[PDB]
């Protein structure tokens, strides 16, 4: 007996940019989508979701500065909220 | 270095939602996997300097949200691909609750580069294929497990800029 | 005098299905997805962002039934939460 | 037929969240605009029957949610792409906080069907396409607003599915 299961389910993606663009990275001080990420994932780890820490990264980059990115979610399917639970 | 959440945090969120997140793993007898691949040399393109840097910070913020990291460096897209069904067949999946999957490279609009890329002849590797191989089929044992894909990699050449007048 | 803009920010895209997969619709009650969005949009609209409402929306798709489809949300540069706030 | 945000709510909301929500413009001046396109008939494909349905839903939901809605039917690729340009230029946007595009045709993995659509004779509008048009050039008039679009078809004709015994 068999039984069906959804192909593709519980995914999420996020790039450092938008498709088409351009991503920076810094030659001493790394790539700023990956410092940005790590700041937001140490801060609100504890009390947002993955999907509402990846809005707050992309937030932190509304204004272009002199190196304009958007890091973009992409293809998810999450069905619940993921929380990571740090300390536990 | 990650905010922990307290025992006031926790069920304040077990409250705030109900049946509508992701289930956790005894932290004793959980076994959380992440695989970051980075590629800084390359035949064909400029050093990716810096990238040292992304590595580490990576890997210890991975490490203290309870993650063993495997890190793979300068390769193909076959080799990618290779490590990443190797990835996706790895038992420990099996009791844990979640992944990462970090990539870090040179990157084009079709895909992420491998260490041989160059616009004569092609060295990619598609998102497509990276959610493929970790799939329902492919990667069953992360079936209803939260699957995040992070990728630092241009997505092709443009600065993402309109210009405005004032 | 010049001044620098975004290309692509503040979208999301909801679609029915997710990629190389089907969608259903039945030929007298309508499209699955679309009826089980407005069902949600109603309900919720009142106290979710659009993000939240389009993963309630994808949990009610979650056990693949008879006919299943997964909802996938799309290309995310929302940097903000979208509230609707009904009845303002 | 919406649950209405009450006072409560809503400052609960603009309490919750400090500077992180969208801006909604003041009820009395602001002109909300959706647009549905919908594809029912075909050359060579079979008649999408229930559609009447989404479109009776989507237009009424749209309309108590505030948004002026336009609706086209039976277009050519060709067609969608000239009225959503007509639809990015329309400058009630200027005075709007907001919009809905949503879509509704047999599609297949490269993008939404035409009218026209044969696997002989593509008719096709790309996703990609729809985020151009809508984008900060193309319709500056939504810059910093958000932008919601919503598409049923078909993303290929896999049933989307994996079997495992038991």
New interface residues.
């Given amino acids: 007996?068999?039984?069906?299961?959804?192909?593709?389910?519980?995914?999420?993606?996020?790039?450092?940019?938008?498709?088409?663009?351009?991503?920076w990275?810094?030659?001493?001080?790394?790539?700023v989508?990956?410092?940005r990420?790590?700041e937001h994932?140490?801060?609100?780890?504890?009390?947002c979701?993955?999907?509402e820490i990846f809005?707050?990264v992309?937030?932190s980059?509304?204004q272009?500065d002199g190196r304009?990115?958007?890091p973009?979610?992409?293809?998810?399917?999450?069905?619940?909220?993921?929380?990571?639970?740090?300390?536990? | 270095n990650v905010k922990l959440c307290s025992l006031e945090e926790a069920q304040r969120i077990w409250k705030q939602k109900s049946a509508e997140i992701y289930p956790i793993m005894d932290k004793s007898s959980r076994t959380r996997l992440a695989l970051i691949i980075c590629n800084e040399e390359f035949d064909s393109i400029p050093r990716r300097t810096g990238a040292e840097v992304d590595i580490t910070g990576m890997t210890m913020l991975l490490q203290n949200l309870g993650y063993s990291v495997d890190v793979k460096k300068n390769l193909t897209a076959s080799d990618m691909t290779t490590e990443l069904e190797a990835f996706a067949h790895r038992p420990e999946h099996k009791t844990s609750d979640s992944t990462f999957l970090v990539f870090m490279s040179h990157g084009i609009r079709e895909g992420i580069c491998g260490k041989k890329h160059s616009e004569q002849v092609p060295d990619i590797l598609q998102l497509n294929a990276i959610f493929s191989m970790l799939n329902t089929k492919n990667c069953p044992s992360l079936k209803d497990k939260p699957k995040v894909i992070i990728i630092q990699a241009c997505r092709g050449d443009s600065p993402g800029v309109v210009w405005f007048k004032d």
């Fill in positions: 007996a068999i039984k069906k299961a959804h192909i593709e389910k519980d995914f999420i993606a996020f790039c450092s940019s938008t498709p088409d663009n351009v991503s990275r810094h030659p001493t001080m790394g790539s989508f990956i410092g990420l790590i994932m140490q801060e609100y780890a504890c009390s979701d993955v999907e809005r707050k992309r937030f980059f509304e272009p304009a990115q958007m973009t979610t992409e293809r998810v399917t999450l069905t619940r909220c993921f929380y990571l639970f740090p300390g536990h």
